[PDB]
Amino acid sequence: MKALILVGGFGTRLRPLTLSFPKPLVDFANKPMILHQIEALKAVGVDEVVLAINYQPEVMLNFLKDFETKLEIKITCSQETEPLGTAGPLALARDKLLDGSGEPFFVLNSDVISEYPLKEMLEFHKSHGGEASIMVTKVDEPSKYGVVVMEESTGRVEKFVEKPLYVGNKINAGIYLLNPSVLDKIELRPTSIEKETFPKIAAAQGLYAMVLPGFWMDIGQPRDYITGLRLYLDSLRKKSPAKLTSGPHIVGNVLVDETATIGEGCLIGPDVAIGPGCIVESGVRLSRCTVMRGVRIKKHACISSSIIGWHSTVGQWARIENMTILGEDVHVSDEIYSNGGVVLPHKEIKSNILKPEIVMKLAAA
Ligand SMILES: Nc1nc2c(ncn2[C@@H]2O[C@H](COP(=O)(O)OP(=O)(O)O[C@H]3O[C@H](CO)[C@@H](O)[C@H](O)[C@@H]3O)[C@@H](O)[C@H]2O)c(=O)[nH]1
């Protein structure tokens, strides 16, 4: 059984984090983004995973090479030449997805986080004997996504419309399970899976949708990255609560790597992820933030609703809030305030950053 992960490019919308590591390698909840999906694929018996990418794969071959041996799984890159769309790279990796076993393959959107009930999706797939299965989840604004109108009891989808006028409340969750026959409806040309391939399969009465249990989020923009960690950590509390840390210094759900250190007098939480090798000194306040590998938060600093990149340094009594994104190896001096700062890697912040909402929503004029 095979799987393909639609990655895309390096990730412009996630700068300055993606100036150091490509989109699938950026840490989410203390492990590289791509590992959340590769681990879920291995759990259901996938033996090879193809990364449909846009860039030179040498930059991430060192990362995957250890995870290949560690997870006992094969990872190959399928770099495209020209923009092939969302169904194009499915045909560019036709030789890698079809081994002759006749078994279906998974297709995952790399920007999507969920619980991945792939085992239940596999038995759902065999039950209806259809050509393609897709996961669906409800949202409040089904207009920024692609609505899947479907019939109950069977799950057969009736149409796959994109950028719709309320046509339904279920949307494509970016988790596909496709039979080998799907690859016959895709040419080796730029083609869109949501506009062409899925409507065809629905017309042939062979497209089925399964309601996705649990959380779902498309972490494209860093604002959704903060919301994504909250939903993930809530899922972790329900499935395996012992993986979250607790104590008098903890409020809500906090995920601390085993090699991180927390000094006395801290107040960490809610919705905080502290990466490996981190040093949180005394009297630090962290909330709704991601602290990546190897950063140091000095005494009495207060970080909220922000993302501190790898190997950054936050000075004593520094105050970081309101979606501040620090790149790799950013040094924030003592007693500095940052509101909405977006700092390129390796920079030293010696002056305050003042980009509040009232400031930005007033500079429009
Ligand atoms: N190999 C390759 N990958 C691409 C390309 N274009 C986009 N991708 C990647 O495929 C994924 C889909 O991203 P978009 O093309 O921007 O579509 P979308 O607006 O985000 O919406 C789609 O995803 C939602 C999440 O499941 C769906 O809800 C929605 O229905 C739709 O399928 C992303 O990870 C993107 O990097 C391409 O030309 N080639």
Residue numbers in the entry: 1 to 164, 166 to 366
The study reports:
Plant vitamin C biosynthetic pathway contains conversion of D-mannose-1-phosphate (Man-1-P) to GDP-D-mannose (GDP-Man), a step catalyzed by the Man-1-P guanylyltransferase which is commonly named GDP-Man pyrophosphorylase (GMPase). Arabidopsis thaliana VTC1 is the first genetically characterized plant GMPase and has unique properties when compared with bacterial and animal homologs. Structures of two GMPases have been reported, which are the crystal structure of GMPase from the hyperthermophilic bacterium Thermotoga maritima (TmGMP) and the cryo-EM structure of human GMPase (GMPPA-GMPPB complex) that is arranged into a dodecamer. These structures show that an oligomer-forming monomer (protomer) of GMPase consists of two domains: an N-terminal Rossmann fold-like domain and a C-terminal left-handed β-helix (LβH) domain. VTC1 dimerizes via its LβH domain and forms a dodecamer in crystal.
The 3.0-Å product-bound structure was solved based on the unliganded VTC1 structure. Different from the unliganded structure, the overall structure of product-bound VTC1 has a threefold symmetry with each asymmetric unit having two dimers. Six dimers form a dodecameric assembly in shape of a three-petaled flower. The two dimers within an asymmetric unit bind a total of one GDP-Man, two inorganic PPi, and two citrates. Specifically, the stalk protomer binds a citrate, the middle protomer binds a GDP-Man and a citrate, and the inner and outer protomers each bind a PPi. The two dimers can be aligned with a root mean square deviation of 0.49 Å. Their superimposition demonstrates that citrate and PPi bind to the same site on catalytic domain. The product GDP-Man binds at the edge of the central β-sheet. The oxygen at guanine C6 forms a hydrogen bond with the backbone amide of Gly85, the guanine N1 forms two hydrogen bonds with the side chain of Asp80, and the hydroxyl groups at C2 and C3 of D-mannose form hydrogen bonds with the side chain amide of Asn173 and the backbone amide of Gly146, respectively. The pyrophosphate moiety of GDP-Man is flanked by, but not directly interacting with the catalytically critical residues Glu195-Lys196, Asp111, and Asp219. It makes direct polar contacts with the backbone amide groups of Gly9, Thr12, and Arg13, the hydroxyl group of Thr12, and the guanidino group of Arg13. PPi binds to the same site as citrate, but in the inner protomer, the interacting residues differ from the afore-mentioned residues in that Gly9 is not directly involved and Lys23 replaces Arg13 for ligand recognition.
